[PDB]
Design a protein around this ligand. Sequence first.
Ligand SMILES: Cc1cn([C@H]2C[C@H](O)[C@@H](COP(=O)(O)OP(=O)(O)Oc3ccccc3)O2)c(=O)[nH]c1=O
Ligand SMILES: Cc1cn([C@H]2C[C@H](O)[C@@H](COP(=O)(O)OP(=O)(O)Oc3ccccc3)O2)c(=O)[nH]c1=O
Ligand SMILES: C[S@@+](CC[C@H](N)C(=O)[O-])C[C@H]1O[C@@H](n2cnc3c(N)ncnc32)[C@H](O)[C@@H]1O
Ligand SMILES: C[S@@+](CC[C@H](N)C(=O)[O-])C[C@H]1O[C@@H](n2cnc3c(N)ncnc32)[C@H](O)[C@@H]1O
Lengths: 241, 241
Amino acid sequence: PQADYSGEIAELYDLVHQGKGKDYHREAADLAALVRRHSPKAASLLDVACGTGMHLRHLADSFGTVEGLELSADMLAIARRRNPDAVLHHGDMRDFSLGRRFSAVTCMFSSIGHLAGQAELDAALERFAAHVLPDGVVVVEPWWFPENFTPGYVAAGTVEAGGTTVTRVSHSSREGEATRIEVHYLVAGPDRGITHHEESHRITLFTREQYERAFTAAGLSVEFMPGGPSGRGLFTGLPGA
Amino acid sequence: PQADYSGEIAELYDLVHQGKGKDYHREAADLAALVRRHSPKAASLLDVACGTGMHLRHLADSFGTVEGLELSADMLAIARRRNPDAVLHHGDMRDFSLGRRFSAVTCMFSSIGHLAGQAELDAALERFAAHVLPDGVVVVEPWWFPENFTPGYVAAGTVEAGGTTVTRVSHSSREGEATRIEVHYLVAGPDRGITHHEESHRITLFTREQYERAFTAAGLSVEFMPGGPSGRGLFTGLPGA
Ligand SMILES: Cc1cn([C@H]2C[C@H](O)[C@@H](COP(=O)(O)OP(=O)(O)Oc3ccccc3)O2)c(=O)[nH]c1=O
Ligand SMILES: Cc1cn([C@H]2C[C@H](O)[C@@H](COP(=O)(O)OP(=O)(O)Oc3ccccc3)O2)c(=O)[nH]c1=O
Ligand SMILES: C[S@@+](CC[C@H](N)C(=O)[O-])C[C@H]1O[C@@H](n2cnc3c(N)ncnc32)[C@H](O)[C@@H]1O
Ligand SMILES: C[S@@+](CC[C@H](N)C(=O)[O-])C[C@H]1O[C@@H](n2cnc3c(N)ncnc32)[C@H](O)[C@@H]1O
């Protein structure tokens, strides 16, 4: 039903991804070490599709200035509360223009898969290049590629916090050149009873070559790293191709 | 939504109660030892609201003849497959008449709480007495009493079998003289995706005295045993009051 990271889905986001084991503190430390490898003097970072601003909160401990861009107002509201001294823009990775550049431009946890087709992917990569300093680095965490996607995958987990029990179950299928992921939730607590929610997303299965193509078209040199924080690896790009 | 143990709810019953830890083999052994305490020569047993026939399957190893009665055709279908050599009647605990008596008449796992009011409870207890041999025993596992019910209770568990993942979440609230239990399910598998189901039941909170009253009115001597297989204790009754 929803595909827009809104309402109760946005409110549940952080608890469910923490319950699944996601460690944004570690991921931010790793990201900052990776960035400083390619740009030793790096000072500022823009996190695109920053969601609830969990990486930004931790990256602020490593970078003098951090900033975000996010499409969903409800995600953004959470992010702004968590990062009250940073600028967080409501906008679209396909066409934003902030009039400034950063040491690092990051786009994490498969947000890039919400783009449809090579044209949107190239457009986003060009915007990321349009916002990186000449000595900086772009980091994009892809969705699954066709060559590593597992169709029929079922993930189920339950987490409890503050008196509330949340179960999240996903099923991922092949829909042409994308994954269809259906996600259902049961949210329960003594005072509120049980509520059911659902999300459904089409997330594009770009090949590695297609990602590399978008980096190249944007003037970035590209390298893929397998494994990565979420099993999908990580691409890094440097201006100067 | 449903309150009638039908369709997919009936199909999910055994897997969810097994995942929650219910051991019908142990409960049947205990029940047979309890019965033989009060009726050493006991030979036959009628399980009323026998559901999917899980106690009957195991009790058949202890009693020469076992038989069941169940209101829901879909539960009964499962029970009949599991117990192909026994007679399993489609009927109602409030008014059935089988024209024969048994060494033991059992009614397990709070099925008795599906009755509304003292009149139905007394009617069922009189039917149970109308089907027990003079030297036999009646065993009724109650629902919660007002004095031991915990309102706001949330139970969540996930079990996997045969490629299918099932999450069941319940919330129990006080509705006058009953509990309102709402139960939601998520059923997931690689081939079938995710489906959501729900049940809602009103289950009467009779006091211990009200149970004892129904046994007495039916000519049975009554004893309550705390704890029991499901935390609600157990009543046993003997003809001859
Ligand atoms: C398909 C798939 C999943 N997983 C692993 C990956 C993950 O550990 C788990 C699936 O969990 P779920 O909540 O559905 O997806 P995420 O955690 O990625 O969250 C997001 C969902 C959509 C957009 C972005 C992020 O199984 C794989 O290892 N291979 C696969 O092909
Ligand atoms: C209210 C309540 C529950 N529990 C325990 C009892 C149980 O271990 C758990 C609740 O699990 P759930 O699936 O909702 O109920 P059942 O397993 O009884 O199944 C049936 C439901 C309805 C009709 C018959 C049987 O919490 C308690 O200890 N006290 C309570 O007051
Ligand atoms: C899986 S979440 C990842 C959020 C965050 N980066 C993290 O690691 O938790 C995907 C995010 O992409 C955002 N998003 C989707 N399409 C977008 C677009 N065109 N521009 C900006 N953000 C977008 C969603 O609103 C959501 O916050
Ligand atoms: C919680 S289930 C217990 C089933 C079984 N005794 C067990 O231990 O698994 C409650 C059962 O009561 C049955 N039931 C409800 N009202 C009934 C009635 N009036 N007569 C007979 N069975 C009834 C339901 O159809 C269901 O099978």
